[PDB]
Amino acid sequence: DLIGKVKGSHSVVVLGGGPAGLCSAFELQKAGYKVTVLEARTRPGGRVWTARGGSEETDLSGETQKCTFSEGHFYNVGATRIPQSHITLDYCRELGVEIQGFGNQNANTFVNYQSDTSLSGQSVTYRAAKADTFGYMSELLKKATDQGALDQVLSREDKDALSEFLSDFGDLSDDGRYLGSSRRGYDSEPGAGLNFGTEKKPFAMQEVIRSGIGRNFSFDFGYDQAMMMFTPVGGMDRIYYAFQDRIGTDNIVFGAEVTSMKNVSEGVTVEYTAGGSKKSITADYAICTIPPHLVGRLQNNLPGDVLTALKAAKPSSSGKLGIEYSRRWWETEDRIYGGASNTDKDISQIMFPYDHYNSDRGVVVAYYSSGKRQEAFESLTHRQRLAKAIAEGSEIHGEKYTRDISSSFSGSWRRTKYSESAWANWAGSATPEYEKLLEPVDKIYFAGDHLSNAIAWQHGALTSARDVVTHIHERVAQ
């Protein structure tokens, strides 16, 4: 469907076997091209990397971690969740990669933030934080409406409609006050007979407002984050092993470290080291998916203004750490099944698993941070990272967070070879550097999530691949 069949013989070399490079290869093959993918790593998928039992990684600081998670247990060190709009889902369909729901919103996970209130550092469930925030917000807006404050922008009918909504939205008393709600939850669960349970009591208005316990609620609305969300059963990398299988390992050189990319008379020549040897491959066209800050390191004959453009896609920090617990305390004690706790601490968030519900063990993502709050972990050894994660996590979920730990494994994307970034931020943000890089450089085409309007999304890398393959095809057709 992407493009028609190609007439005659035509070759492409793809640099990088991440999502953009594998998608490119896949589509080019379908159309009848000869394709070769050159991947530096020994796995397919790039920044889509799933940590499981056996995974070993040596980072740019020379520390080697060996993952020992139990069979079936894993976490996604990069890409982990997909919204419904993204072409990633269509590819899961085409490739036969089963998906399942990803818990991107949960009433029972915690918020915990510092403030000049008695709620400072205190863990509060989302449903409680929500009921209080929306209760007092609805009360206040109703107060202003009744007061006449909005008489110049609302009719009398409007005011009565708005009021009705606010009473229900905020679960207000009959006289317009927020006095609590069953929406907060219960200290004792409603049962049978005369066991009515006991609601959790509300916090006071000023402390709710000043605590900032609602600071993350808008996350629920993000176009790429709103429920429903999805993820492949058994890891996000299953998409890229499905791509690898379809392309054929014959057409993918793993452990191929590209060192040179040059426009030549016959197309593009790419030199790479694989198996200790210097190798060369020439093809009619090349699709370069190596992260833009790493492309400059190659030997090349790219024009000055292209090399300057590449530098404007600044690299960024992000990272995760996952802990296998031998007891699913979050489910058994906290009644949390998936979702994420959120905090202002460096850890940023604690993400609970979306598989093996009610089982005996599980991996928790003890932190997923970015920017400044990932810089706080980058330089730390793995052991140090873990200690900092458990310390900060115990401040949110209690002592239980320190118990029943089997193993752990971290990644910091700025510190990981062949990435050296989580994703690009273009200086000046389309920027002129981004625009420039959409243009082919003779027979060299750039592709990847940085050359999309969904940077840090697989959809970005995949729509980039698809656009580039379409361009090459339309050129070949003439």
Ligand X SMILES: Cc1cc2nc3c(=O)[nH]c(=O)nc-3n(C[C@H](O)[C@H](O)[C@H](O)COP(=O)(O)OP(=O)(O)OC[C@H]3O[C@@H](n4cnc5c(N)ncnc54)[C@H](O)[C@@H]3O)c2cc1C
Ligand Y SMILES: Nc1ccccc1C(=O)O
Nearest position to ligand X, beta carbon: 18
Enumerate long-range contacts of 182-185, CB under 8 Å, 24 or more apart: 183/127, 183/130, 183/131, 184/125, 184/127, 184/128, 184/131, 184/132, 185/107, 185/108, 185/125, 185/127, 185/128
Distance between CA atoms of residues 90 and 99, nearest Å = 11
Q: What part of residues 229-288 is at the interface with a copy of itself (CB under 8 A)?
A: 230
Distance between CA atoms of residues 381 and 361, nearest Å = 26
CA distances from 456 to 61, 126, 257, 347, 418 (A): 24, 27, 23, 20, 16
Which x/- pattern over 62-101 shows residues binding ligand X (rule: CB under 6 A)? ----------------xxxxx-----x-------------
Using CB under 6 A as the binding rule, whether residue 291 contacts ligand X is answered as yes
Is 383 known to sit in a ligand binding site? Answer: no
Query: At closest approach, how far in Å is the CB of 81 from ligand Y?
Result: 5
Number of residues in the chain: 478
Q: What part of residues 427-456 is at the interface with ligand X (CB under 6 A)?
A: 448-449, 456
Query: At closest approach, how far in Å is the CB of 448 from ligand Y?
Result: 14
Distance between CA atoms of residues 313 and 332, nearest Å = 45
Judged by CB under 8 A, the residue of 15, 283, 336, 386 near a copy of itself is 336
Please, what is the angle between helix 19-30 and helix 458-477, to 10°?
40
Given a contact cutoff of 8 angstroms between Cβ atoms, the answer to whether 269 and 282 are in contact is yes
Is 232 known to sit in a ligand binding site? Answer: no
Query: At closest approach, how far in Å is the CB of 457 from ligand Y?
Result: 5
Judged by beta carbon, residue 50 or residue 80, the one nearer ligand Y is 80
Query: At closest approach, how far in Å is the CB of 15 from ligand X?
Result: 5
Bridge partner list, 287: 14, 445
Query: At closest approach, how far in Å is the CB of 182 from ligand X?
Result: 17
- Count Cα neighbours of 472 within 13 Å in the Cβ-side half-sphere: 36
Is 296 known to sit in a ligand binding site? Answer: no
Given a contact cutoff of 8 angstroms between Cβ atoms, the answer to whether 313 and 446 are in contact is no
Given a contact cutoff of 8 angstroms between Cβ atoms, the answer to whether 107 and 334 are in contact is no
Q: What part of residues 428-447 is at the interface with a copy of itself (CB under 8 A)?
A: 430, 435, 438, 447
Is 426 known to sit in a ligand binding site? Answer: no
Q: What distance lies between CA 461 and its chain's CA centroid?
A: 13
Q: Identify the H or E element spanning 319.
A: strand 318-325
Using CB under 6 A as the binding rule, whether residue 232 contacts ligand X is answered as no
Interface with ligand Y by CB under 6 A: which residues?
A: 80-81, 456-457
Query: At closest approach, how far in Å is the CB of 232 from a copy of itself?
Result: 10
Judged by CB under 6 A, the residue of 16, 135, 214, 393 near ligand X is 16
Distance between CA atoms of residues 100 and 93, nearest Å = 12
291 binds, among ligand X, a copy of itself, ligand Y, none (CB under 5 to 8 A by kind): ligand X
Bridge partner list, 343: 112
Query: At closest approach, how far in Å is the CB of 337 from ligand X?
Result: 15
Using CB under 8 A as the binding rule, whether residue 89 contacts a copy of itself is answered as yes
Q: What part of residues 345-404 is at the interface with a copy of itself (CB under 8 A)?
A: 354, 357-358
Q: Which residues are annotated as a binding site?
A: 19-20, 39-41, 47, 78-81, 225, 258, 368, 449, 456-458
List residues near ligand X by CB under 6 A.
15-21, 38-41, 46-48, 78-82, 88, 256-258, 289-291, 294, 318, 413, 418-419, 422-423, 448-449, 456-458, 460-461
Q: Which residues are annotated as a binding site for substrate?
A: 81, 225, 368, 456
